[PDB]
Amino acid sequence: TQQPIVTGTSVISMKYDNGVIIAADNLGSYGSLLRFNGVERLIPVGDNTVVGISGDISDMQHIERLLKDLVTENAYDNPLADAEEALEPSYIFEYLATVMYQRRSKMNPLWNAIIVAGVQSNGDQFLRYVNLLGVTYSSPTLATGFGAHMANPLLRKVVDRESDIPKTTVQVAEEAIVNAMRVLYYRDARSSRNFSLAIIDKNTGLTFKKNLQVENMKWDFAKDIKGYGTQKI
Amino acid sequence: STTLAFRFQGGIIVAVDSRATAGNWVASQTVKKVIEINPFLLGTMAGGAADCQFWETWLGSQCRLHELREKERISVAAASKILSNLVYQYKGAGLSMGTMICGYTRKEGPTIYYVDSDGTRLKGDIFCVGSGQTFAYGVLDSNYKWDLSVEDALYLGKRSILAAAHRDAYSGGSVNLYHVTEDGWIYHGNHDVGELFWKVKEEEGSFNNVIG
Amino acid sequence: QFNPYGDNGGTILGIAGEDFAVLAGDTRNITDYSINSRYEPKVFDCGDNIVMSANGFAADGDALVKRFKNSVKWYHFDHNDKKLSINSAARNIQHLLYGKRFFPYYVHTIIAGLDEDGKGAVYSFDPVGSYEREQCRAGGAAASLIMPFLDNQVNFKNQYEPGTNGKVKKPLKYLSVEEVIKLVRDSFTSATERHIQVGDGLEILIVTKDGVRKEFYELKRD
Amino acid sequence: TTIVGVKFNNGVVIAADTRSTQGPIVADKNCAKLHRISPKIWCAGAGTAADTEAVTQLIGSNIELHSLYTSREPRVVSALQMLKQHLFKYQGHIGAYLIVAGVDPTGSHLFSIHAHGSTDVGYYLSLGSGSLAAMAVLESHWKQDLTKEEAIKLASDAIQAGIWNDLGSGSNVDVCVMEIGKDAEYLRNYLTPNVREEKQKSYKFPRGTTAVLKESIVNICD
Amino acid sequence: MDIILGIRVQDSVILASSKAVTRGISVLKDSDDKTRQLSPHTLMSFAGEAGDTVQFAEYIQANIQLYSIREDYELSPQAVSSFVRQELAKSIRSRRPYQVNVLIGGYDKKKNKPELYQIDYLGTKVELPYGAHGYSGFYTFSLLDHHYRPDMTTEEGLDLLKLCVQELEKRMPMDFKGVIVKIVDKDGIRQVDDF
Amino acid sequence: MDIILGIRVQDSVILASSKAVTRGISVLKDSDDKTRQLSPHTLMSFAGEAGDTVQFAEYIQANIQLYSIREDYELSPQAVSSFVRQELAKSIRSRRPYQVNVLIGGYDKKKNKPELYQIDYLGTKVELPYGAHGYSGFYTFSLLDHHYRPDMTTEEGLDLLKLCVQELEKRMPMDFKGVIVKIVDKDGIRQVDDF
Amino acid sequence: TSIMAVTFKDGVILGADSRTTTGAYIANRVTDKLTRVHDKIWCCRSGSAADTQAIADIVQYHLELYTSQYGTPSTETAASVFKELCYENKDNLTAGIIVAGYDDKNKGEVYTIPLGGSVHKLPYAIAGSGSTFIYGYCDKNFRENMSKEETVDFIKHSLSQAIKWDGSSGGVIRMVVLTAAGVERLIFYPDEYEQL
Amino acid sequence: GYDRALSIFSPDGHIFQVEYALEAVKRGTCAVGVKGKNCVVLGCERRSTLKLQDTRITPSKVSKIDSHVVLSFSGLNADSRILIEKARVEAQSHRLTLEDPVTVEYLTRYVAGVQQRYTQSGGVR
Amino acid sequence: SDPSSINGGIVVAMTGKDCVAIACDLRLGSQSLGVSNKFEKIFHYGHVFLGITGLATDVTTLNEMFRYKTNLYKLKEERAIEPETFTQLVSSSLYERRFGPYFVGPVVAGINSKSGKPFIAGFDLIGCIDEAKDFIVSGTASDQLFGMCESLYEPNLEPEDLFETISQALLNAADRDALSGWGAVVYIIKKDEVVKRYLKMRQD
Ligand SMILES: *[C@@](C)(CO)[C@](*)(O)[C@H](CC(C)C)NC(=O)[C@H](Cc1ccccc1)NC(=O)[C@H](CC(C)C)NC(=O)[C@H](CCc1ccccc1)NC(=O)CN1CCOCC1
Ligand SMILES: *[C@@](C)(CO)[C@](*)(O)[C@H](CC(C)C)NC(=O)[C@H](Cc1ccccc1)NC(=O)[C@H](CC(C)C)NC(=O)[C@H](CCc1ccccc1)NC(=O)CN1CCOCC1
Ligand SMILES: *[C@@](C)(CO)[C@](*)(O)[C@H](CC(C)C)NC(=O)[C@H](Cc1ccccc1)NC(=O)[C@H](CC(C)C)NC(=O)[C@H](CCc1ccccc1)NC(=O)CN1CCOCC1
Ligand SMILES: [Cl-]
Numbered sequence A: 001t002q003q004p005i006v007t008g009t010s011v012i013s014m015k016y017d018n019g020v021i022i023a024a025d026n027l028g029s030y031g032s033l034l035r036f037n038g039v040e041r042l043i044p045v046g047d048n049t050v051v052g053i054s055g056d057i058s059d060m061q062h063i064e065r066l067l068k069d070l071v072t073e074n075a076y077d078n079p080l081a082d083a084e085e086a087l088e089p090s091y092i093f094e095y096l097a098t099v100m101y102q103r104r105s106k107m108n109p110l111w112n113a114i115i116v117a118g119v120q121s122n123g124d125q126f127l128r129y130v131n132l133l134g135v136t137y138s139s140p141t142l143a144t145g146f147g148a149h150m151a152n153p154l155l156r157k158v159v160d161r162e163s164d165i166p167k168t169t170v171q172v173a174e175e176a177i178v179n180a181m182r183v184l185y186y187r188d189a190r191s192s193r194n195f196s197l198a199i200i201d202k203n204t205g206l207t208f209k210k211n212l213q214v215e216n217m218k219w220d221f222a223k224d225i226k227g228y229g230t231q232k233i
Numbered sequence B: 001s002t003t004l005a006f007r008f009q010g011g012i013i014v015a016v017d018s019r020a021t022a023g024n025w026v027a028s029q030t031v032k033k034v035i036e037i038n039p040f041l042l043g044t045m046a047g048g049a050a051d052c053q054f055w056e057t058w059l060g061s062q063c064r065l066h067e068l069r070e071k072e073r074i075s076v077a078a079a080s081k082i083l084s085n086l087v088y089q090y091k092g093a094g095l096s097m098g099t100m101i102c103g104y105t106r107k108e109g110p111t112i113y114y115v116d117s118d119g120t121r122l123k124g125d126i127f128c129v130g131s132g133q134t135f136a137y138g139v140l141d142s143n144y145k146w147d148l149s150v151e152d153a154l155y156l157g158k159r160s161i162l163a164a165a166h167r168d169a170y171s172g173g174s175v176n177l178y179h180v181t182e183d184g185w186i187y188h189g190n191h192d193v194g195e196l197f198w199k200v201k202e203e204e205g206s207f208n209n210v211i212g
Numbered sequence C: 001q002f003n004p005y006g007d008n009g010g011t012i013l014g015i016a017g018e019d020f021a022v023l024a025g026d027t028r029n030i031t032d033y034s035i036n037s038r039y040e041p042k043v044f045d046c047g048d049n050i051v052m053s054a055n056g057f058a059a060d061g062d063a064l065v066k067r068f069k070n071s072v073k074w075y076h077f078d079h080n081d082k083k084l085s086i087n088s089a090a091r092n093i094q095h096l097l098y099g100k101r102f103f104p105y106y107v108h109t110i111i112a113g114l115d116e117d118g119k120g121a122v123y124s125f126d127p128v129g130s131y132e133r134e135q136c137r138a139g140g141a142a143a144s145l146i147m148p149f150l151d152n153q154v155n156f157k158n159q160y161e162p163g164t165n166g167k168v169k170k171p172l173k174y175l176s177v178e179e180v181i182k183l184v185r186d187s188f189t190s191a192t193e194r195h196i197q198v199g200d201g202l203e204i205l206i207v208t209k210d211g212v213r214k215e216f217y218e219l220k221r222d
Numbered sequence D: 001t002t003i004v005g006v007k008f009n010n011g012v013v014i015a016a017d018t019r020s021t022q023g024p025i026v027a028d029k030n031c032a033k034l035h036r037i038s039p040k041i042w043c044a045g046a047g048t049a050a051d052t053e054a055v056t057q058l059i060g061s062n063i064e065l066h067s068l069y070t071s072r073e074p075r076v077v078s079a080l081q082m083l084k085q086h087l088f089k090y091q092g093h094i095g096a097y098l099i100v101a102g103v104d105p106t107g108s109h110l111f112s113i114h115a116h117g118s119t120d121v122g123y124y125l126s127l128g129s130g131s132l133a134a135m136a137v138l139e140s141h142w143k144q145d146l147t148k149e150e151a152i153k154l155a156s157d158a159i160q161a162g163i164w165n166d167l168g169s170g171s172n173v174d175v176c177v178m179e180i181g182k183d184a185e186y187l188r189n190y191l192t193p194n195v196r197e198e199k200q201k202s203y204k205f206p207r208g209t210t211a212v213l214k215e216s217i218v219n220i221c222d
Numbered sequence E, F: 001m002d003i004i005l006g007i008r009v010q011d012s013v014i015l016a017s018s019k020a021v022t023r024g025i026s027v028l029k030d031s032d033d034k035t036r037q038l039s040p041h042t043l044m045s046f047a048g049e050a051g052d053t054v055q056f057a058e059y060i061q062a063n064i065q066l067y068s069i070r071e072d073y074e075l076s077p078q079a080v081s082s083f084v085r086q087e088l089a090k091s092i093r094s095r096r097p098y099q100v101n102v103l104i105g106g107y108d109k110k111k112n113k114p115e116l117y118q119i120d121y122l123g124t125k126v127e128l129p130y131g132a133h134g135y136s137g138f139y140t141f142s143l144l145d146h147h148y149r150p151d152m153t154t155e156e157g158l159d160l161l162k163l164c165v166q167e168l169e170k171r172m173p174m175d176f177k178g179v180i181v182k183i184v185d186k187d188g189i190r191q192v193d194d195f
Numbered sequence G: 001t002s003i004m005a006v007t008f009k010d011g012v013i014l015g016a017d018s019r020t021t022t023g024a025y026i027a028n029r030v031t032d033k034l035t036r037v038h039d040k041i042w043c044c045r046s047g048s049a050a051d052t053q054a055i056a057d058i059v060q061y062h063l064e065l066y067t068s069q070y071g072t073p074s075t076e077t078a079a080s081v082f083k084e085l086c087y088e089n090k091d092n093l094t095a096g097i098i099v100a101g102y103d104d105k106n107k108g109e110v111y112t113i114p115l116g117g118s119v120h121k122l123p124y125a126i127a128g129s130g131s132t133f134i135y136g137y138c139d140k141n142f143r144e145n146m147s148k149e150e151t152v153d154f155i156k157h158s159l160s161q162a163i164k165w166d167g168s169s170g171g172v173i174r175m176v177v178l179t180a181a182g183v184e185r186l187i188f189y190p191d192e193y194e195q196l
Numbered sequence H: 001g002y003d004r005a006l007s008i009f010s011p012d013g014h015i016f017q018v019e020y021a022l023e024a025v026k027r028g029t030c031a032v033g034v035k036g037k038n039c040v041v042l043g044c045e046r047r048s049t050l051k052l053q054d055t056r057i058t059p060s061k062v063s064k065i066d067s068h069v070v071l072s073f074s075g076l077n078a079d080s081r082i083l084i085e086k087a088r089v090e091a092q093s094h095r096l097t098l099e100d101p102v103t104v105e106y107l108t109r110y111v112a113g114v115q116q117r118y119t120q121s122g123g124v125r
Numbered sequence I: 001s002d003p004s005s006i007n008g009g010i011v012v013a014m015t016g017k018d019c020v021a022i023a024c025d026l027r028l029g030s031q032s033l034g035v036s037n038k039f040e041k042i043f044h045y046g047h048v049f050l051g052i053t054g055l056a057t058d059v060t061t062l063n064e065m066f067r068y069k070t071n072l073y074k075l076k077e078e079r080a081i082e083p084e085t086f087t088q089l090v091s092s093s094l095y096e097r098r099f100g101p102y103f104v105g106p107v108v109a110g111i112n113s114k115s116g117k118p119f120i121a122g123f124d125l126i127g128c129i130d131e132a133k134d135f136i137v138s139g140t141a142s143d144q145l146f147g148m149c150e151s152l153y154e155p156n157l158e159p160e161d162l163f164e165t166i167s168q169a170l171l172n173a174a175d176r177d178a179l180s181g182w183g184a185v186v187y188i189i190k191k192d193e194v195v196k197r198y199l200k201m202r203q204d
């Protein structure tokens, strides 16, 4: 039995024609206090997988160490560690999914929601979710926390089903992700303006973007709003 | 559920309903609440479905192992006590079982043992177990005599379940009848309450509370 | 306090014919008022002509299916590649479920296939392992909506022969695979209309002596 | 529920879905959540269904009497004030979450009211279980100086977001347009994107299927 | 208070009510009459919370007697039962409800028919051929379902009632010290002294 | 399980134990023997939680019988009672204690004296001239205080015991379906069939 | 919420963020927490949105009725009416209000009214969840008899920090200037204040 | 724990420790059992090199396992006590679970099973 | 101690071609104990029919209350109340007890005598009106009834066909609920004739 202390908010992601995009802001909240601002919640594994984690940060750091150790262990007695026997997104996910469910079954969970985004060796897009309960599901768009409520509706307007994936380009997909991050900044009280974004493409590979900012915000209309009903000054 | 079994001149009658509930949701009308342990032993099931079903089939395995080791069919007393000693180990853990081990052996004769999940084990001539046990008792006790014929005893057992199936909201479906003799148990059919009630009402002239 | 259970919604449905059996289930996965996936299958081919679904808390559902699939694998290893019969699978699943009697898998399990006489078989389980063979069973969130409809249309309950003064019952008969799929589709469209956790898609797995075939149908996405 | 309100050039538009729930069960697939307080003041309601209906009728009744007393067309702020003071008095126990909009001699107005009695002002608003799905759309596509046709499109798109993504919302989209100098137009079932597909089978029973015990003519006349 | 039964037969209504009054681990009395005559042809038995039972019975009794004097006329069992139900229906939403369950056995002189009404403390009224309150019903209803016939005589009804009391004395946990039996018919109310 | 009594007289110990076994609102059995013979001249009655009672009695019985075989010798009632007390004294601080109250009636052959021990589930042992467990004591102790004499015969003890059972049948709320009476003396243990 | 009111040479300035929250969801990102109870008597609202509105509405009604009979009320009088409501109904209210006004005799005045319903007259006042993070900053930087531009910077920098650390505070920084000249509304957007 | 395999096979297929245990039995005082038509009689030898014995208290050669079964022996006296104790416990255990005393075959089968277990358990003779 | 599921029971209403049907079970129990198999839950005031499920004391109280109100209505208005108007009266009366409600699930059914239009409506315990073209359900087996009605129902059924549909909906729903059943009644309502039929169903 735990209670989360230092927390990370929404992780959002979607599939596009050649790969997957994933994003998450750089905040480490301590309740209502926006305590830590340099927190990286996207963690790459190899050159083909990115694990996005929300929830308790101490448990996130534990998961980082496991993934780091997983890469090391895979390299042992493995001449094809950087080729045919390299770590796949599906391997990394299933490992985490196993751990998450084992921990919930011992009544001592890792208080997180995790999204493993990547590209398989055969070029197929991989995007799957797992959380503290060990619950797993996959979808063309996946999001955690407030992202599930606000980002998914927006991302589903682009990719509403499987057949929309080949029709969606990386430009259109990234634009929707960046828009969703702005909406979350408007409406999620435990979010920050600064965020990281990662693209895993089957052709161009892993592109990790740091220190992005929400921009092109609409605040001007606020000046016209006076009082709460009858005030005209 | 409603289950009964009583001892009489011509052996043992065993009768059960077939309903299974999850709260007010009627989950099944076709549950087998009598377990056939061997040609001379029967076990009735009331309470938690899984608890009864799992541990009474387990009981059957223990009874088989007895007759392999001892080259002799297990006694009704020993069979019941295996089950009672088992549930006693789980006392407090929350098992829910109201069972009756009915059978015949040479040394014992016809015998009935009531065994429940809080460790109670009682030998007796008449028992009714389940949510509708009281309704079954009312009809059974008021019509019971030791000198009942096999035909009348079978009907009284059937009629007592019907009585409970009617009044108890958590009993119904159909009646399963068994008759245990010196030669072993004999199945006396599945009787759907849907047809049985009206057949009994018309022929017997009872159930005048219901709109005919 | 940490709550180890959750409700992933959805509903499942199993019907048995004469020489076939179907196991259907919607593809929607939810938590509270949010949709997690519109296509997340929960009806699985487990080998030996046995299809299985464990609806309720998906984590426990997946764990169970995973363990049973593994049980089928080791049954082959230990018993000279013998085919696991549907009745034997059912009993094996009871022990899996009851093994966690004091920390249950929160799922309604249904399996379907053919018995050893080649006839259609459906078995259903409660969360702690009580099981029963039936011609008909719905399980999950919309089971209370679908099940009485099945009683009426599959087992012809409360239906009497016209003009017989409610004395002769409508005679029981096996349904064709075509007629069964009609009932499955109508059951799920009805359930989708009146239950919020049911919708998106319908996936049916049909089991005959020839193997395991699949069919998919769209459901309302609201 | 999902309900929204959007201001535009010469007035204001409000919209709503048409699902009414009872736990996980859809009770009404086409209920009207848009309420007329006065001819040109309309109200979208979310929360406890009886409360939203009762509170909107009461204030609507008192507004009519006030209008007749003062020989003036009623104002949105009067409805806003009467609603909030009533709701506040009951400390949130009357579970009415309202989006109040309309046109009056002062101009066009858009407000929201919560059950505890707090009010908010805005150009675009959303309330109900699917307000987050709707607000995401509003935050993404809203701009200053919307036309009538653009505001209707934005409002209905925001409701649709709720219909598809929120399990609490579904079925159809109702709209009401309140423009200055014109009659308010109530667009009942403006969109109907959730039509039930043809059933696979007709379940019309053969006459005499049901077993009957008695018949009798009932006397309705004096 | 525990066991109260009622059986309507061809020409009468028979009420049976337990004699025991128990508080704690002591049977304080074994000759308690748990009934009141509301009118010459209407009898009400009662069972429930201590104090409430008698207070309610006597309050109803006083009201029915007041009516009888005012109109010089006896209210029908149906009318009395409706009055009693309404009082309990008011009571359940009071500050402190009457926790009293009643059976009203009466003979309607205009219809020449016996009538038995079962009313619980919530104000739930039903007319029945046979009735019971508390745990008694769990045994007696099924027993009566089997043995009861609508055209029975008062003597047959008393034998049917003995069959209920015997079953209760066999299977009930508590000692209720037998029953006081009363018969309501065209000639009014009378008590069976030897039961 | 409810009523268990014990009376030590001049030359014997008399145990009386109720026959009723009740769960819920049903008397499941009315001929239950709530006792076990531990040795030829030692008898233990018991009452308490369902299942625990018999499981504990039979466990003690097996241990005393094992001792008797090993040593070819009968343990004294004092020795048996001390063994039983210690088992209950261990039990009370276990994960799940035995909730069983016992009376041990025995005849010491070396002393030529009857002995009655009362032991509760905590392991509280007392030797007494007369004893009881549960609510029975609240009536029987005062009654015995008055009517008991130390030099009474077995027949006088049985009449004294009838006086207890009558009082219990009058004032106890529950129907305990009479008692099974057993006598322990120099000639061993025997049951009174007509009580 | 993050709110504050600061007296200065020419009068007083009220300041506030624009965030209204339901748990972690921002129900309104453009809220106006600075509200008029009289021509030149305003208040900052923190706590229950419903309670603070209901209170302010009543105070406005009282001061309007006061003005009809006895002419313009003092800023102290306004604070006394707020207190009376907050104190007498302390069991049923969650309202932290700062009252600020401009008299010609008394110049700028600030009264703060915490949960209990006690009154405290101060040179400047801070309140709301985000105020905790700026006690250190405001105490070190506040000076009496500041100019208009200095006070605007003081409030801007202060609320900028409160907003930065408090998740319950954000959006725009609204300000209301109360002087003999009249009433002036000011607004400051994220792009400006965030990078201070 | 002491684990050594003391009872083991030899080249010729014999377990010498079991066979040497038989020699100990051969050394022990003679015991005889004869069963009639309605009875069994157990006779036992007592060596007469021991005078000044106290026959009241000296352990008797025949031991009651239950009220209906007896056990006599030949060989090591100390070893016999362990078997007798185990048998007496199993006798009471059988009565407790089966609600019936042991058969003579069952009691024998148990005692024989104990003796066998000590022929292929580590650390015991 | 859940008022709505102590006594048990169900009501269902359907529309057809120029006709309406309303049906109910006959059970009244006290949790597990079945007490009465004659407890009807459908009443009528002129040509307007009202079915009520839930706590039985309130079912009776409300019947007596609406009889009271409809009688006074008729004396003052000099005409019988119509289904649309009665629906509003039911809603007003239930919401009058907003913070101390009658634990009921009422269902109005009838044909407007002026327009001839079939009308049905349902309510929650505090008076929220649920109007419907097709069908209304209520009671302890409402889930079951929702499932039966949604699959079996089709529009514009003739009175004789509508009878079969509504009966099969009620019966099969009642058989999956422990607190419902023990007999059933069906009302078929045409413009100026009303037929009442008692159904044969399993008595467990
Ligand atoms: C009469 C009918 C009532 O007692 C009989 O006694 C029968 C006995 C037969 C079946 C052997 N008893 C029951 O039917 C028994 C009643 C009961 C239920 C639960 C606890 C004690 C007694 N019913 C069951 O056991 C049902 C049988 C299923 C429906 C076939 N099972 C459940 O209720 C299961 C298991 C409950 C459970 C028990 C112990 C540990 C864990 C779980 N519960 C669920 O499936 C949960 N629920 C079902 C509806 O959907 C939401 C989840
Ligand atoms: C979206 C759809 C919410 O998801 C909207 O906000 C709509 C608003 C529209 C319809 C005006 N909300 C609902 O549909 C609302 C959801 C809800 C439910 C319960 C509490 C709060 C909100 N549903 C209702 O209000 C239904 C309307 C019925 C289906 C016509 N009412 C109920 O479900 C009532 C609740 C009554 C209530 C009493 C006291 C406090 C709060 C609510 N519940 C029942 O009738 C359940 N039960 C049936 C058996 O008898 C006992 C009561
Ligand atoms: C900062 C945030 C902290 O001090 C500020 O003080 C602002 C002040 C502005 C609004 C004047 N405070 C808030 O925004 C305020 C914070 C708050 C919350 C709870 C108690 C006191 C203060 N937020 C609110 O008032 C929101 C306003 C809604 C979004 C319009 N209201 C709620 O959260 C209400 C609180 C009800 C309440 C509880 C205790 C005392 C008084 C009122 N809660 C809900 O409405 C919950 N409801 C559940 C169903 O779905 C809708 C929301
Ligand atoms: Cl506000």
Ligand SMILES: [Mg+2]
Residues within 6 Å of the ligand: B164, B165, B166, B167, B168, B169, B170, B171, B172, I203, I204
């Ligand atoms: Mg029943």
Ligand SMILES: [Mg+2]
Residues within 6 Å of the ligand: G163, G164, G165, G166, G167, G168, G169, G170
């Ligand atoms: Mg902030």
